[PDB]
Amino acid sequence: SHMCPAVSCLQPEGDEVDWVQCDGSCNQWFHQVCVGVSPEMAEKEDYICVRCTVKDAPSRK
């Protein structure tokens, strides 16, 4: 169950639903249901998880 590093890990039949790769700074694959990806962001394939946002290192912190 380490192939998807997510606390709120919604597990279907396994290879049932559609996934998404959070590139950002982790590149870990999550099911859309697992991390609740809105179909707009999922269409854009653009889902940056909390770790990637908080370890993005902005121009002001």
- Chain residues in the site for Zn ion (CB under 5 A): 4, 6, 9, 22, 24, 26, 34, 49, 52
Residue spans of alpha helices (H) in the chain: 32-35, 39-43, 50-54
Q: How far is the CB of 26 from Zn ion (least distance, A)?
A: 4
Q: How far is the CB of 7 from Zn ion (least distance, A)?
A: 9
Q: Which is nearer to Zn ion, 37 or 39 (CB)?
A: 37
Q: Which is nearer to Zn ion, 3 or 61 (CB)?
A: 3
Count of C-beta atoms within a 10 Å radius of residue 35: 19
Count of C-beta atoms within a 10 Å radius of residue 13: 6
